[PDB]
Amino acid sequence: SCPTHADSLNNLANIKREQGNIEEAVRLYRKALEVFPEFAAAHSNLASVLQQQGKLQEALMHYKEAIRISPTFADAYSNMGNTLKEMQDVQGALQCYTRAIQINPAFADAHSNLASIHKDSGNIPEAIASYRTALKLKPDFPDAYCNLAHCLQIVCDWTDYDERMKKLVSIVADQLEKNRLPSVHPHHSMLYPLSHGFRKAIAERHGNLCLDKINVLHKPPYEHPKDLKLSDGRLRVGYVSSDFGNHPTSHLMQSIPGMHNPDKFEVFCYALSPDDGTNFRVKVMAEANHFIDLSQIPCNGKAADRIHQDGIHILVNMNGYTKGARNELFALRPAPIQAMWLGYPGTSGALFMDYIITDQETSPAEVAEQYSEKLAYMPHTFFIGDHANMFPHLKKKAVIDFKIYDNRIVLNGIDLKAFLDSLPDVKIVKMLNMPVIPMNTIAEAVIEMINRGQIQITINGFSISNGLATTQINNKAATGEEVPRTIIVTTRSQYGLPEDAIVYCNFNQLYKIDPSTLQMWANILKRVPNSVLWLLRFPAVGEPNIQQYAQNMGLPQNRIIFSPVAPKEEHVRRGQLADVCLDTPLCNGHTTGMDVLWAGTPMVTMPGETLASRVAASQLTCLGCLELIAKNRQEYEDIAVKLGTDLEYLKKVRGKVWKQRISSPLFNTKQYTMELERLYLQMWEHYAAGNKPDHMIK
Amino acid sequence: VTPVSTA
Ligand SMILES: CC(=O)N[C@@H]1[C@@H](O)[C@H](O)[C@@H](CO)S[C@@H]1OP(=O)(O)OP(=O)(O)OC[C@H]1O[C@@H](n2ccc(=O)[nH]c2=O)[C@H](O)[C@@H]1O
């Protein structure tokens, strides 16, 4: 009955919580409430440890009570909001934050939380506004500061950049040492100059967040199989992803499940998300030996059960710390061997992950200390892409001569050859080899369709489509879900690129550019006097910010050209218009690397120390283009400048990429799968021999 | 949309 008794129990539970014994903190809070049920703060505290435990349904009930007892409890509103957000009720979470701010206009956390909703929604300027308000109200606020830092990064606001980075590092350093959870997200940690040890520790601490959520399930260790007898001589591999659908991950690996050899492997795909109806999902479902929809099994215990019950030997985490992940599944440890693969470009930092599948160029042995996992090397690159299957219409090109350039007016199509054979005057320039249509009436009709902005025309009974209009012609083709069934014209004029200039492209999201990268590029642009730099409005608000810094570096406006973000197929195809692609050294083009190389566009890169900054080098090594890999800033600029100034060297390198992209192992998904299969069996033979995981560096 | 990978 007694408020003082209950107050004491609350203090004793707050003590158990600090000592990390969550278990017992709850039992005490619950007892404080049984003594004095109208105890605002006990309800609030019980609620926020229930939230930690992932018991969201019940956490929310206690927050509601806390608010009922104490209506000015702005802190409780803000946290209730967080709970609603995690429950997918973004609408109602927003109402919590707004309602808190109204009760206490001075309450920083609610502002920061409101900013988070904005950030997630993609409205970045409104996210920035709120983060700044939070920081005005409470100037020492690591969560808000680091989130703001990432917003600013996203739009290329580099105001006080150097001072900002030093502060991030300092904030993280302090949080690690005081054992609180870092405010920098592991998926962002590659963007700031933290130590490698810090990056690993940030990941480690995100891994721990699962532990509390799985401990309340009280599950015993699972008993893993120790031979392949039950599974019929076949090794059972389970791919776990929230991205079996229209998502980069599927655009890279959709072909792999079907290519596993069924004599030795049984493939299980565990989808973490509902069927989005796209062909990517269709294909994996149809080709995996087993497809399991875990989105229907939202309890992590029952899902982990299902994995174990299927008898998986190697469970593959294709998500790391990206949206949709459910690492609780991996923490429950239902498979004897669990490997990170392809999806997340960094270490999990977690004890429940055994291997990271990588390669010698991406993660050389010198830097094995960056990863908590043991390195398991693929023989060439760990990276793969479905471009050979998705976009076969780009395996060959043809050009129109409008005066012999390989990238001014381009034609691709499955039936390109049959069309060209209907034409009278086609020259065949040697290298395969590239056809050149001369300035005819036919050439004139193609270029008039482009100029007048028309959808499509017919020539000799072949359909000729305007490259800018694919989604109107055949939307599934535009997305990469189908191969286009028409001939597609792609021209520089379409995107406002100068007909007679060296074009340097970078199609990544703008967040990957930092002030050094922009400096590097300005340097190249000054030295190659005709060049332009081709960038995307990704996102658009970044554009006026780049243009601004570009001018302080002394480049006129008309030297950097911005295009809108394109549908997948148009995006890949229009790389054919660039001369060279300059890769961001801070965080490489990954999927975007494969995309630009498929078009046969050479890419200059400067491999850093982090995984994310080494991928492009790795892709190029596998292609067999070591001359595009720079050791420093100076060498990067030099390679780029030579490529723009020496037109015979350009022609030569471009031709090398165009050929290598078929003949090397890079885009060869069958060979990749087989290599992955070798590496799986190695991992297994080792575990069956009774060993703990160790480096698989061959 | 054009889907990218996020945190
Ligand atoms: C740093 C990082 O997170 N890297 C990840 C890798 O580690 C993972 O292996 C990849 C698979 O999980 S995801 C990711 O790969 P990234 O290269 O960083 O590309 P990001 O995530 O921004 O997506 C761009 C998309 O926009 C498409 N894109 C781009 C421009 C355009 O006009 N149209 C378009 O479709 C591109 O084709 C893409 O489809």
CATH code, domain with A581: 3.40.50.2000
Distance A592 CA to ligand 1 centre (A): 6
Which one-letter amino acid corresponds to residue A378? M
Question: What is the DSSP code string of A614-660?
Answer: THHHHHHHHHT-GGGB-SSHHHHHHHHHHHHH-HHHHHHHHHHHHHH
Tokens of A407: 């990238």
**d(Cα A518, Cα A514) in Å, to the nearest integer?**
6
Same domain, A97 and A71: yes
Q: Strands (DSSP E) along A446-486, which ranges? A: 456-459, 462-466
**Measured between alpha carbons, how far is residue A209 from residues A84, A204, A205, A214, A215 in Å?**
18, 9, 7, 9, 11
**d(Cα A172, Cα A203) in Å, to the nearest integer?**
12
Q: What is the DSSP letter of A241?
A: E
| H/E segment holding residue A673 | helix A669-688
**d(Cα A467, Cα A32) in Å, to the nearest integer?**
68
- Check if A479 has its Cβ closer than 6 Å to any atom of ligand 1: no
Same domain, A517 and A635: yes
Solved using = X-ray
Q: With beta carbons less than 8 A apart as the criterion, state whether A591 and A386 touch.
A: no
**d(Cα A203, Cα A226) in Å, to the nearest integer?**
30
Q: With beta carbons less than 8 A apart as the criterion, state whether A83 and A63 touch.
A: yes
Same domain, A183 and A152: yes
Resolution of this deposited model, Å: 3.1
Q: Which residues, in sequence order, are CB contacts of A384 under 8 Å at separation 6+?
A: A252, A253, A256, A342, A667, A669, A672
**d(Cα A4, Cα A65) in Å, to the nearest integer?**
20
Give residue for tokens 């796209």. Answer: A278
**d(Cα A130, Cα A109) in Å, to the nearest integer?**
10
Same domain, A125 and A235: no
Q: Find the DSSP H helices in A19-123.
A: 22-35, 40-52, 56-69, 74-86, 90-103, 108-121
Give residue for tokens 């003082």. Answer: A4
For chain B, give the longest Cα–Cα distance: 17
Q: Best of A147, A323, A471 to disrupt the B interface by mutation (most B CBs within 10 Å)? A: A323
Beta bridge partners of A271: A241, A293
**d(Cα A545, Cα A547) in Å, to the nearest integer?**
5
Which one-letter amino acid corresponds to residue A625? C
| H/E segment holding residue A307 | helix A300-310
Domain limit, last residue, from A218, A250, A284: A218
**Ligand 1 atom 22: residue of nearest CA:** B4
Looking at beta carbons, which residues of chain B come within 8 Å of A188? 7
**d(Cα A632, Cα A605) in Å, to the nearest integer?**
10
Number of other residues whose CB lies within 10 A of the CB of residue A75? 18
CATH number, position A84: 1.25.40.10
Which one-letter amino acid corresponds to residue A287? E
Nearest Cβ partner of B3 from A185, A248, A343? A248
Best CA proximity match to A329, nearest among A191, A211, A434, A428: A211
Same domain, A223 and A354: yes
Alpha carbon A487 to chain centroid distance? 32
Best CA proximity match to A252, nearest among A410, A301, B3: B3
| Nearest chain B residue (CA) to A321 | B7
Give residue for tokens 């990064």. Answer: A153
Closest ligand 1 atom to the C-alpha of A343? 12
- SS3 at position A534: strand
Q: Which residues, in sequence order, are CB contacts of A215 under 8 Å at separation 6+?
A: A22, A23, A53
| Cα atoms found within 13 Å of the Cα of residue A30, Cβ hemisphere only | 10
**Measured between alpha carbons, how far is residue A183 from residues A178, A199, A205, A333 in Å?**
13, 12, 11, 27
Q: Which residues, in sequence order, are CB contacts of A512 under 8 Å at separation 6+?
A: A584, A586, A587, A588, A589
Q: Chain A closest CA to B1's CA: distance in Å?
A: 8
**b/e map A272-297, b = 16+ CB within 10 Å:** bbeeeebbbbebbbebbbebbebbeb
**d(Cα A483, Cα A27) in Å, to the nearest integer?**
60
**d(Cα A428, Cα A466) in Å, to the nearest integer?**
24
C-alpha angle A595/A486/A483, rounded to 5°? 45
Q: Specify whether A43 is catalytic.
A: no
- Check if A252 has its Cβ closer than 6 Å to any atom of ligand 1: yes
Q: Find the DSSP H helices in A452-531.
A: 470-473, 475-479, 515-527
Output phi, psi for A88, to 5 deg: 75, 5
Same domain, A212 and A227: no
Q: Strands (DSSP E) along A565-610, which ranges? A: 580-582, 603-604
Same domain, A103 and A118: no
| Cα atoms found within 13 Å of the Cα of residue A167, Cβ hemisphere only | 16
| Nearest chain A residue (CA) to B1 | A567
Q: What is the DSSP letter of A629?
A: B
**b/e map A431-440, b = 16+ CB within 10 Å:** eeebbbbeee
Beta bridge partners of A355: A339, A374
**d(Cα A66, Cα A178) in Å, to the nearest integer?**
29
Closest ligand 1 atom to the C-alpha of A591? 17
Looking at beta carbons, which residues of chain B come within 8 Å of A321? 7
**d(Cα A54, Cα A9) in Å, to the nearest integer?**
23
Residues in chain B: 7
A97 is in which domain, residue-wise?
1-107
Output phi, psi for A269, to 5 deg: -110, 120
- Check if A550 has its Cβ closer than 6 Å to any atom of ligand 1: no
Beta bridge partners of A266: A236
Question: What is the DSSP code string of B1-7?
Answer: -------
- Check if A506 has its Cβ closer than 6 Å to any atom of ligand 1: no
Q: Is there a cis peptide before residue A539, judged by omega within 30 degrees of 0?
A: yes
Same domain, A626 and A695: no
Q: With beta carbons less than 8 A apart as the criterion, state whether A236 and A266 touch.
A: yes
**d(Cα A358, Cα A614) in Å, to the nearest integer?**
11
Tokens of A574: 């229009």
- Check if A539 has its Cβ closer than 6 Å to any atom of ligand 1: no
**Measured between alpha carbons, how far is residue A149 from residues A132, A156, A189 in Å?**
10, 10, 12
Same domain, A425 and A475: yes
**d(Cα A521, Cα A161) in Å, to the nearest integer?**
18
- Which strands sit side by side in the sheet containing A265-271, from one edge to the other? A290-293, A265-271, A235-241, A314-317, A337-341, A355-359, A374-378
Tokens of A11: 């203090």
Domain limit, last residue, from A218, A237, A268: A218
- SS3 at position A375: strand
| Cα atoms found within 13 Å of the Cα of residue A246, Cβ hemisphere only | 17
Tokens of A28: 């005490």
Domains contained in chain A, number: 5
Q: With beta carbons less than 8 A apart as the criterion, state whether A256 and A349 touch.
A: no
Same domain, A536 and A488: no
Same domain, A231 and A214: no
Output phi, psi for A357, to 5 deg: -85, 115
Looking at beta carbons, which residues of chain A come within 8 Å of B4? 248, 509
**Measured between alpha carbons, how far is residue A322 from residues A168, A247, A254 in Å?**
21, 12, 18
Q: Which of A278, A512, A592, A672 to mutate to test the pocket of ligand 1 (most atoms within 8 A of CB)?
A: A592
Looking at beta carbons, which residues of chain B come within 8 Å of A566? 2
Domain limit, last residue, from A186, A218, A250: A218
What part of A 490-519 touches B (C-beta under 8 Å)? 509
Query: Is B7 within 8 Å of A248 when comparing Cβ atoms?
Result: no
- SS3 at position A678: helix
Same domain, A6 and A97: yes
